[PDB]
């Protein structure tokens, strides 16, 4: 074959390797690459022949799984400098315009979109931005231009980077809790109407904040979760202390009456967040409900109006059979909303869980690129609900509240769960060990203001 021998030795590059069985695997137009070696990925991600924009953005939202960003940018270096084959102009004009120059171009593509979309790589690692410069800086030709000048001016945008609503939004409401009295704040002090809209606007917040490659091959479960998941760990940690925060309140509230209407404004915050879209929000207060130390409390459970037990059975029922009920009601509704974001952790992990991370063919290990798809896949509908800002009012006293919770103090968290469900057999003891009474611990009214807003 002569288009082979138009290409260069392997002996002088790595990338013009001939396709086979025992280096790559196409999946069942452009072919989707199922798995294969760095190598052939790093090639195929820079082919050519074509444009593959879907694989660009897949390699670079999941490459940190396989291959170290430092890794990649020498890998990308080396694929750009392709070697030109000695003289006899006629065969180096070609090889120059249909070879080189295509394939020097799908780098610099690489290295906006990597820059553009990915330079949180490049703030890690200091090192690693000297080099993407050093290498920018040492260019040639007049299509090459173009591309390093618009690397360089994103790449200084990021530099500068580092350092409105559209209708009238609704009157903040207030309760018992004076507008600036912040010693007072607490879960029935506070209205429920603004308790659940200012956890919503965080909630939304930190939904918005989270990257994809913030949950490629399981990072935020391993020895550098801190820097390569920090937003999803934000949002995680949230999620716990509300929960056990409302946990909390319910259980340390050991007169039965008080403990009632506890229960009942939590149940009253759950609706206001349904009436927001925030499954977040409202799978919060199922996942709190449902914990051993509180849904064991049936004295209290009995006092709770029917009309409220319906409505926290019903929320409970978006979870049931792998949450259909939940994703009918997701896709049916308008923005804003925020998505329940722990379906999204337990279908990763299943993927990761579920999938090898290589594939063997004839002794040799290839990467299994198809299961770095499915994860960018999920990452998809993560980000297609994450521009959906809500017309609301942010008050920031109350949102600094709910941002400072603690429920566990300095206790970890399953001696502070342990202690929970002790207290729950403190305040409702099991059969036929007598109900006790318990002195009140509240010296403000306890009826709710309700959930039906002003005008
Ligand atoms: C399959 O088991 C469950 C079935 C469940 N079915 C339903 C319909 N809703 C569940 N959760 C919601 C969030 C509820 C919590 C508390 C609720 C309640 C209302 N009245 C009483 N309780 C418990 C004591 C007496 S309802 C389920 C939770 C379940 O496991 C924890």
């Not at 980077?161 to 002090?189: C, K, M, N, Y």
């Not at 990257?211 to 920090?230: A, C, H, R, Y």
Request: hydrophobic share 35%; net charge neutral; glycine share 2%.
């Amino acid at each position: 074959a002569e288009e082979q021998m138009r290409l260069p030795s392997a002996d002088v590059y790595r990338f013009a390797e001939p396709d086979s069985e025992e280096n790559i695997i196409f999946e069942e137009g452009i072919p989707i690459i199922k798995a294969g070696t760095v190598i052939k990925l790093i090639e195929r991600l820079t082919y050519h022949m074509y444009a593959d924009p879907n694989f660009v953005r897949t390699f670079l939202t999941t490459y940190r799984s396989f291959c170290k960003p430092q890794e990649l940018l020498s890998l990308i270096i080396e694929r750009f400098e392709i070697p030109e084959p000695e003289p006899t102009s006629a065969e180096l004009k070609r090889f120059r315009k249909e070879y080189i120059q295509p394939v020097q171009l799908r780098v610099l593509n690489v290295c906006r979109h990597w820059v553009e979309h990915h330079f949180y790589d490049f703030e890690r690692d200091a090192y690693l931005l000297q080099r993407m410069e050093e290498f920018i800086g040492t260019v040639r030709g007049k299509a090459m231009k173009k591309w390093v000048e618009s690397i360089t001016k994103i790449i200084q945008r990021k530099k500068i980077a580092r350092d409105t609503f559209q209708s009238s939004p609704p009157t903040v409401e207030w309760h018992i809790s004076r507008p600036g009295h912040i010693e007072t704040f607490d879960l029935l002090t506070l209205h429920p109407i603004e308790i659940a809209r200012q956890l919503t606007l965080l909630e939304s917040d930190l939904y918005r904040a989270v990257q994809p490659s913030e949950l490629v091959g399981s990072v935020w479960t391993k020895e550098d979760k801190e820097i390569n998941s920090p937003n999803l760990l934000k949002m995680i940690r949230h999620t716990t202390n509300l929960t056990l925060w409302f946990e909390k309140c319910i259980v340390e509230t050991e007169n039965l009456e008080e403990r009632v209407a506890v229960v009942s404004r939590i149940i009253e915050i759950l609706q206001v967040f349904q009436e927001l879209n925030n499954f977040n929000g409202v799978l919060e207060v199922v996942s709190a409900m449902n914990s051993s130390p509180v849904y064991r409390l049936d004295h209290t459970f009995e006092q709770i109006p029917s009309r409220q037990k319906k409505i926290l059975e019903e929320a409970h029922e978006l979870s049931e059979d792998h949450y259909k009920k939940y994703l009918a009601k997701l896709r049916s509704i308008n923005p804003p909303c925020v998505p329940f974001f722990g379906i999204y952790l337990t279908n990763i992990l299943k993927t990761e869980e579920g999938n090898p991370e290589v594939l063997k063919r004839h002794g040799k290990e290839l990467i299994n690129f198809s299961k770095r798809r499915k994860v960018a896949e999920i990452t998809g509908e993560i980000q297609q609900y994450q521009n959906q800002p809500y017309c609301l009012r942010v008050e920031s006293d109350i949102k600094r509240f709910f941002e400072n919770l603690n429920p566990m103090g300095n206790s970890m968290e399953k001696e502070f769960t342990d202690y929970l469900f002790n207290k729950s057999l403190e305040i409702e003891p099991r059969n036929p060990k007598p109900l006790p009474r318990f002195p009140k611990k509240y010296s403000y009214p306890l009826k709710s203001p309700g959930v039906r807003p002003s005008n």
